[PDB]
Amino acid sequence: GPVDAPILLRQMFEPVSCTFTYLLGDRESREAVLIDPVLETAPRDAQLIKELGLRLLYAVNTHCHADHITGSGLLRSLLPGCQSVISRLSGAQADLHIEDGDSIRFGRFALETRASPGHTPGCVTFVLNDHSMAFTGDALLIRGCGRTDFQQGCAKTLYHSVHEKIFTLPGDCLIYPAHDYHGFTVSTVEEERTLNPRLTLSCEEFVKIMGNLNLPKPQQIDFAVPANMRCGVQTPT
């Protein structure tokens, strides 16, 4: 029986791309926001929103993804009034564009935009005004981080992004990444800045490891990125 109506938070999971989608909502004003929605599960998302009696104000992407197609464009039609949002530095199409310091207001809540490039130049982190939660996209993963060998990625930039924008948050602040490949669903700032095998290294040691992963080009990057630059629109049927 806490005095204030707790924020509504629902974490969904797309098993193939291992992508996390996040639904945030004000329980009282029934306004909501959707972070990193996937195209294939867009109608599922929309169904839950209607079932919860919520109204979707924004469909937001932490960055231009290369592993799946965004559902933000589809949601504009499935939920009239909804607006697509993405960083200006992503260079990707959307109804609205944000940059560092921008605030996405929904109900009595707000997601504060902190630019955290590295994985891509357009990566941003969404911190709840409470500073109790942070949605880090692929900038910071649980016990890891996004690769920096593609999409004009820079390891040195990533290292500084996380240390200056995410690790500077309260230790108790939750970490909700855009992906997880090991069965986790959440972490904390305190955990990562203490235990993250990569980000606890020096910047030097970090850059040298990120360049030696020698991972392969993702399967969908050729079809995923362009579609996301156009807010999800791809050749039909």
Next chain:
Amino acid sequence: PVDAPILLRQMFEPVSCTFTYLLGDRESREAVLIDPVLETAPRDAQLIKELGLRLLYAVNTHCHADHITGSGLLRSLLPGCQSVISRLSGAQADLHIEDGDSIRFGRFALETRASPGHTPGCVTFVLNDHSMAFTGDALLIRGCGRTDFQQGCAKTLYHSVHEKIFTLPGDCLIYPAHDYHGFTVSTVEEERTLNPRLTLSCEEFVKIMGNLNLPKPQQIDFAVPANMRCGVQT
């Protein structure tokens, strides 16, 4: 709200689609673990040490047919911790429980509510707060567990949920043991109103659950015997 909030971590096992839940008291450093899987026990143990917790109980909601419990192996990796399962499951464990029993860890408590149906040994763990309920395969998100194996009974399942789960506060969270559609959490309010199966008449519910004509899970002939003996295979 002066005492620290409960620690809660939801892990996911992709092939089995199983949810393992780590619950802990931040101030007491005492923890429990609900439905741990064998293939991810080392991972779970490592996380417990990283968080600086001491695992008291490795707990199972019921005797699983889809995977092998990590409760056995965790008794080795984290000495002092004990396996816990319902007496009615007929399964081997260090401790056995029944409706009404509390599993204490720090200032927190899991109220055991006997919720048979999917199996005779199914129980739902309700946080003393009444803000969370770990429902096993009794109540799934927008569904429920199959009732055609492990001596399951549909009429019992319907009653269990309606009497033990739907009686909880509407805003109480629902954390199932599985999900096959990308969800992680639900609420009592939602399932009470939206669960396509359990919102039906009991009589209707008993009918359709038998009509599914699904194939028995592949892992059952190996999971259940191993889980009846705390993870020991063959």
